Amino acid sequence: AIPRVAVVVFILNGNSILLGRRRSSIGNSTFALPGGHLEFGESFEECAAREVMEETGLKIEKMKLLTVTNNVFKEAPTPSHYVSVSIRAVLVDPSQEPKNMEPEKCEGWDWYDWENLPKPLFWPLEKLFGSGFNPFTHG
Amino acid sequence: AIPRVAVVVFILNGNSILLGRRRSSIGNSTFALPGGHLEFGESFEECAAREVMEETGLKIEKMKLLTVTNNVFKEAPTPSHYVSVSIRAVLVDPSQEPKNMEPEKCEGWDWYDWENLPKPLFWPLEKLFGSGFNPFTH
Ligand SMILES: [Mg+2]
């Protein structure tokens, strides 16, 4: 009945970000970022590191705020409204590789080059990229 | 107990922004921006103009997204957690003056020059400003 807060993480690895196909009632099979719901009392940075750990096993650091998007899902089975806070981060150990830690929510994680992204993107992400957003150009 | 979305509005009037002292269980008497809770299905820009209307009677246009802050209020009687989306906007008529529409929540609104802001600012706001954030440029 109310807008809910989610945190999504751009893990910047060379020229690539991490994406995985959703297993979900909303945006099923589309490519999306790791992340999830902000917990009460939790900071954006703690949420980003926690969700990434829980979903991918990756240890990330240097979390920085990117932007925020308003995602109203009208056609969902139960209508939902999410406010999506995006975070950029990098691996702690640069040799790390993801693991599909939550196979019920995701088909698997992989690195995709910014200029060879997969399709279809989860539509909030498609809309953000369509606006010209680029997580690599904020120093 | 769950994070809730608020929208706050920097109403840019020349060199100044609108602020008023809160009457609240949280940040009582500190200077804060107009704002309020995001409604289901609402856009940031819609919520910005609705809450500013409800609270000040002012008409704003040219809403543009600024940034977002995580405001956890652990001190509070009931602990609160607000995720605060800031919007920049300007008056339709740069001469319209504010009205204290919700006196139970605000001592009253006034314009404050960016280079001579009032004290004490509501702490999420001074934190944001301390980071170098500037609503006129950002
Ligand atoms: Mg690089």
XYZ file of C-alpha atoms and ligand atoms in Angstrom:
278
model
C 0.000 0.000 0.000
C 3.051 2.246 0.462
C 6.274 2.952 -1.446
C 9.135 0.675 -0.374
C 12.880 1.325 -0.548
C 15.252 -0.921 -2.465
C 19.008 -0.625 -2.949
C 20.627 -1.802 -6.201
C 24.376 -2.099 -6.731
C 26.487 -1.350 -9.794
C 29.610 -3.432 -9.104
C 32.137 -1.751 -11.396
C 34.671 -4.368 -12.545
C 36.932 -3.095 -15.323
C 34.431 -1.995 -17.986
C 31.703 -4.364 -16.771
C 28.869 -4.531 -14.266
C 27.212 -7.544 -12.690
C 23.734 -8.528 -13.908
C 21.501 -11.560 -13.551
C 18.141 -12.694 -14.878
C 15.340 -12.316 -12.345
C 13.228 -15.211 -11.077
C 10.274 -13.194 -9.837
C 6.647 -12.179 -10.252
C 7.855 -8.745 -11.461
C 10.145 -8.533 -14.479
C 10.644 -12.287 -14.698
C 13.721 -13.361 -16.702
C 14.909 -9.760 -17.340
C 18.469 -8.723 -16.489
C 18.822 -6.773 -13.257
C 21.348 -5.633 -10.666
C 22.049 -7.300 -7.340
C 20.332 -5.671 -4.408
C 17.211 -5.749 -2.307
C 15.143 -4.120 0.402
C 16.610 -1.596 2.805
C 16.308 -2.806 6.405
C 15.111 -0.518 9.189
C 18.101 1.370 10.623
C 20.448 0.225 7.835
C 22.532 2.641 5.754
C 22.562 2.540 1.950
C 26.170 1.316 2.002
C 25.529 -1.453 4.547
C 22.473 -2.550 2.576
C 24.425 -2.667 -0.694
C 27.246 -4.750 0.793
C 24.811 -7.043 2.618
C 22.504 -7.767 -0.306
C 25.431 -8.308 -2.652
C 26.995 -10.727 -0.164
C 23.679 -12.557 0.320
C 22.946 -12.858 -3.390
C 26.400 -13.262 -4.936
C 28.944 -14.040 -2.206
C 31.012 -11.058 -3.370
C 32.717 -8.763 -0.865
C 32.472 -5.150 -2.099
C 33.789 -1.832 -0.774
C 33.882 1.902 -1.498
C 30.089 2.132 -1.807
C 29.029 5.504 -3.258
C 25.586 6.904 -3.970
C 24.623 7.265 -7.637
C 20.979 8.302 -7.886
C 17.402 7.306 -7.080
C 14.514 6.217 -9.299
C 10.758 5.958 -8.745
C 9.484 2.551 -9.947
C 5.692 2.109 -9.902
C 4.681 -1.415 -10.989
C 1.044 -1.058 -12.076
C 0.642 -4.395 -13.873
C 2.138 -6.489 -11.055
C -0.019 -9.306 -9.618
C -0.182 -7.247 -6.425
C 0.559 -3.589 -7.299
C 3.906 -2.488 -5.875
C 5.814 0.788 -5.676
C 9.580 0.814 -5.145
C 12.021 3.672 -4.697
C 15.338 2.345 -5.990
C 18.557 3.776 -4.564
C 21.544 2.938 -6.746
C 25.032 2.453 -5.338
C 28.324 1.957 -7.105
C 30.988 -0.240 -5.511
C 34.051 -2.345 -6.322
C 35.332 -5.756 -5.286
C 37.597 -5.994 -2.262
C 39.591 -8.925 -3.625
C 39.861 -8.319 -7.394
C 40.069 -12.056 -8.183
C 36.602 -12.831 -6.778
C 33.958 -14.487 -8.879
C 30.209 -14.526 -8.164
C 28.176 -17.488 -6.990
C 24.419 -17.856 -7.463
C 23.699 -17.813 -3.746
C 19.893 -17.453 -4.073
C 18.865 -19.608 -7.054
C 15.192 -19.076 -6.234
C 15.504 -15.361 -7.062
C 18.076 -15.376 -9.866
C 19.126 -17.578 -12.771
C 22.795 -16.655 -12.191
C 25.182 -13.683 -12.117
C 27.674 -12.627 -14.769
C 29.821 -9.663 -15.772
C 28.637 -7.648 -18.776
C 30.586 -4.956 -20.579
C 28.914 -1.545 -20.470
C 28.899 -1.349 -24.262
C 27.670 -4.962 -24.707
C 24.832 -5.200 -22.209
C 22.355 -8.102 -22.333
C 18.681 -7.841 -23.231
C 16.014 -7.533 -22.053
C 16.948 -5.278 -19.163
C 14.576 -5.005 -16.223
C 12.463 -2.075 -17.326
C 13.463 0.386 -14.547
C 17.054 -0.275 -15.575
C 16.223 0.071 -19.263
C 14.569 3.406 -18.503
C 17.552 4.630 -16.460
C 20.060 3.668 -19.156
C 17.824 5.195 -21.822
C 18.078 8.542 -20.044
C 21.863 8.541 -20.546
C 22.785 7.411 -17.040
C 26.272 5.939 -16.866
C 27.623 4.578 -13.558
C 31.221 4.851 -14.799
C 31.299 8.639 -15.227
C 31.061 9.847 -11.612
C 34.766 9.488 -10.659
C 9.422 -0.457 11.733
C 10.403 0.007 8.094
C 12.106 2.699 5.955
C 9.618 5.245 4.634
C 10.008 7.574 1.660
C 9.739 11.318 2.118
C 10.204 14.030 -0.489
C 11.683 17.368 0.532
C 11.762 20.436 -1.669
C 14.413 23.105 -2.150
C 12.285 26.050 -3.339
C 14.854 28.290 -5.025
C 13.940 31.995 -4.781
C 16.782 34.049 -6.206
C 19.671 33.418 -3.825
C 17.455 31.966 -1.088
C 15.579 28.832 -0.048
C 12.439 28.316 2.034
C 12.875 26.984 5.591
C 10.811 26.782 8.767
C 11.239 25.501 12.301
C 9.641 22.106 12.865
C 7.025 21.449 15.526
C 7.577 17.729 15.868
C 8.819 14.879 18.007
C 11.859 14.766 15.684
C 14.169 17.742 15.226
C 11.790 20.006 17.143
C 12.499 23.708 16.534
C 15.202 23.052 13.898
C 14.951 24.662 10.456
C 13.839 22.228 7.744
C 12.478 22.144 4.179
C 8.853 21.710 3.099
C 8.088 18.073 2.396
C 6.069 15.024 3.245
C 5.465 11.355 2.670
C 5.451 9.899 -0.827
C 2.062 8.398 -1.625
C 1.588 5.077 -3.388
C 1.788 5.432 -7.165
C 2.875 9.065 -6.824
C 5.850 10.580 -8.644
C 8.571 12.570 -6.877
C 7.526 15.718 -8.739
C 3.841 15.221 -7.925
C 4.563 14.655 -4.230
C 6.822 17.713 -4.189
C 4.092 20.056 -5.454
C 1.320 18.460 -3.380
C 3.212 18.629 -0.069
C 4.496 22.146 -0.721
C 0.920 23.217 -1.519
C -0.491 21.496 1.589
C 2.169 23.038 3.848
C 2.863 26.508 2.401
C 0.133 27.246 -0.173
C 2.887 28.059 -2.698
C 2.756 27.063 -6.385
C 5.991 25.505 -7.638
C 7.181 24.466 -11.097
C 10.261 23.008 -12.829
C 10.755 20.196 -10.317
C 14.103 18.429 -10.848
C 15.563 15.570 -8.817
C 18.564 16.439 -6.666
C 19.684 13.559 -4.448
C 18.588 11.230 -1.650
C 19.647 10.804 1.987
C 19.148 8.073 4.579
C 17.718 9.582 7.783
C 17.558 7.103 10.681
C 16.004 8.600 13.837
C 17.053 6.325 16.692
C 16.687 8.980 19.408
C 12.935 9.318 18.597
C 10.181 8.078 20.973
C 9.198 5.602 18.310
C 12.420 5.124 16.286
C 11.942 6.248 12.695
C 13.740 5.717 9.382
C 13.076 8.039 6.448
C 14.660 7.900 3.013
C 14.598 11.520 1.904
C 14.366 12.447 -1.797
C 15.214 16.092 -2.463
C 13.645 18.070 -5.311
C 14.560 21.514 -6.594
C 11.778 23.817 -7.744
C 10.960 27.467 -8.304
C 7.931 29.631 -7.724
C 5.503 30.112 -10.579
C 5.163 33.708 -9.311
C 8.403 34.884 -7.618
C 6.220 37.222 -5.530
C 3.805 34.719 -3.959
C 4.414 34.604 -0.237
C 4.183 31.519 1.999
C 1.402 30.768 4.459
C 1.806 28.588 7.549
C -0.893 26.151 6.460
C -0.091 23.432 9.033
C 0.730 25.357 12.233
C 0.726 22.126 14.230
C 3.863 21.045 12.293
C 5.772 24.266 11.548
C 6.396 27.595 13.278
C 6.241 29.306 9.877
C 8.117 29.620 6.595
C 10.648 32.229 5.535
C 13.298 32.825 2.877
C 16.954 32.469 3.841
C 19.924 33.485 1.718
C 22.234 30.585 0.872
C 25.215 32.457 2.334
C 23.408 33.336 5.614
C 21.421 30.257 6.568
C 19.665 29.954 9.942
C 20.736 27.756 12.844
C 20.138 25.095 13.989
C 19.388 23.285 10.747
C 17.569 19.977 10.993
C 20.512 17.624 11.299
C 19.988 15.601 8.060
C 19.983 18.956 6.283
C 23.193 20.255 7.869
C 24.817 16.870 7.206
C 23.851 17.167 3.530
C 25.166 20.737 3.349
C 28.377 19.754 5.174
C 29.122 17.383 2.262
C 29.387 20.373 -0.080
C 25.902 19.842 -1.503
C 24.516 22.962 -3.182
C 20.916 22.949 -4.510
C 21.617 25.891 -6.837
C 24.317 24.018 -8.803
C 23.899 20.223 -8.227
Mg 37.589 1.776 -14.635
